[PDB]
Design a protein that fits this description.
Assembly: monomeric
Keywords: cyclic peptide, plant protein
Name: jatrophidin
PDB class: plant protein
Strand content: under 5%
Helix content: under 10%
Structural class: little secondary structure
Number of helices: 0
Entry title: Racemic structure of jatrophidin, an orbitide from Jatropha curcas
Largest sheet: none
Shape: flat
Number of strands: 0
Length: 8
């Protein structure tokens, strides 16, 4: 879900 994490 975080911006920088493509899988989160």
């Amino acid at each position: 879900p975080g911006l920088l994490n493509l899988w989160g």
